[PDB]
Amino acid sequence: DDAVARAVEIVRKQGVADANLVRMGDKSIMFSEKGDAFIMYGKQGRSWIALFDPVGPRQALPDLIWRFVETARAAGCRSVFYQISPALLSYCADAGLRAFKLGELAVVNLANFELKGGKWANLRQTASRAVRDGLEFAVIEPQDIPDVLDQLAHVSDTWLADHNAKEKSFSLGAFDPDYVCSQPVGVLKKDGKIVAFANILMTETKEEGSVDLMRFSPDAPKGSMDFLFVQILEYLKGEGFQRFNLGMAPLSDRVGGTVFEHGERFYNFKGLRAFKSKFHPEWQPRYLAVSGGVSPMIALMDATFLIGGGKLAAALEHH
Numbered sequence: 001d002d003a004v005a006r007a008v009e010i011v012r013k014q015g016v017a018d019a020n021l022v023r024m025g026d027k028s029i030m031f032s033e034k035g036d037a038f039i040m041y042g043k044q045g046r047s048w049i050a051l052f053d054p055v056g057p058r059q060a061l062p063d064l065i066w067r068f069v070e071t072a073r074a075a076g077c078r079s080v081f082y083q084i085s086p087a088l089l090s091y092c093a094d095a096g097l098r099a100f101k102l103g104e105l106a107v108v109n110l111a112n113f114e115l116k117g118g119k120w121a122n123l124r125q126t127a128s129r130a131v132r133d134g135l136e137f138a139v140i141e142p143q144d145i146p147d148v149l150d151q152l153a154h155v156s157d158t159w160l161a162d163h164n165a166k167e168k169s170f171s172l173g174a175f176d177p178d179y180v181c182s183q184p185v186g187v188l189k190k191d192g193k194i195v196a197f198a199n200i201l202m203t204e205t206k207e208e209g210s211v212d213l214m215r216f217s218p219d220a221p222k223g224s225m226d227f228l229f230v231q232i233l234e235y236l237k238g239e240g241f242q243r244f245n246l247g248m249a250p251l252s253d254r255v256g257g258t259v260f261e262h263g264e265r266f267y268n269f270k271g272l273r274a275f276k277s278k279f280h281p282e283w284q285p286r287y288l289a290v291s292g293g294v295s296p297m298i299a300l301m302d303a304t305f306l307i308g309g310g311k312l313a314a315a316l317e318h319h
Contacts, residue, residue: 015207
């Protein structure tokens with residue numbers, strides 16, 4: 001009785017790459033009546049928190065959203081939609097939810113991207129140095145990931161240790177073998193070993209691609225992150241994709257400050273905004289929507305606890 005595998009079937013058929021986060025298995029799933037759309041969500045504090053836009057055909061969305069919001073209310077909890085797109089603002093408002101800007105998503109139009117055409121000098125130069133340093137890129141399909149799982153784990157473990165970092169959840173994936181083997185990975189190799197990898201989040205519609213995990217061993221040279229992103233970008237472009245999402249960046253007032261702190265905590269694991277700006281991306285806003293007139297502060301703190309695994313040790317270091 002695997003709700004997750006059923007949700008994956010819906011993911012494959014739509015265009016939102018980040019809906020693949022359902023594959024982590026740590027989110028509950030609520031299906032539409034016809035079974036053609038779903039909301040994946042978590043529970044934290046007195047909140048039910050949906051992750052991203054509801055997934056599936058737009059026609060299923062108003063009843064599905066309403067079911068989610070009413071089910072949370074019946075359980076004594078507020079309802080939250082975490083990191084929704086502009087196209088969901090009207091649907092969420094029609095269910096009584098107010099939206100607040102969370103940050104912006106960096107999106108690369110793959111048709112126009114031309115590494116050597118003149119508009120991306122910094123990335124072109126960095127990619128040259130990467131090749132000269134001996135870095136090679138490959139995409140590894142799921143069934144071929146077990147054979148390198150020891151190398152991926154080496155990269156992941158040393159990355160976490162290097163950054164004194166702990167695994168997150170909900171909106172961010174973690175090095176869980178079932179999840180890691182479920183989607184293709186892009187890897188960098190040097191001197192015969194993998195020194196970096198990212199999972200490549202795709203769908204069958206070839207609209208949008210993204211990455212979730214992205215990690216580097218101490219043997220990854222400087223510029224490895226730039227090169228891995230460019231290499232995955234070109235792979236997706238070559239496979240016919242329209243867009244490559246590089247991830248969220250923090251918001252460019254107690255409300256706005258809490259929003260900024262939340263983004264600083266969670267949006268800077270695979271390059272800062274300045275790194276994303278090297279791709280001259282389109283910046284698309286994303287939102288937190290909350291029921292009941294509650295201030296976005298409460299919902300965002302619940303999301304912070306939820307992504308941190310139910311824990312929050314301290315404020316971030318700031319001067």
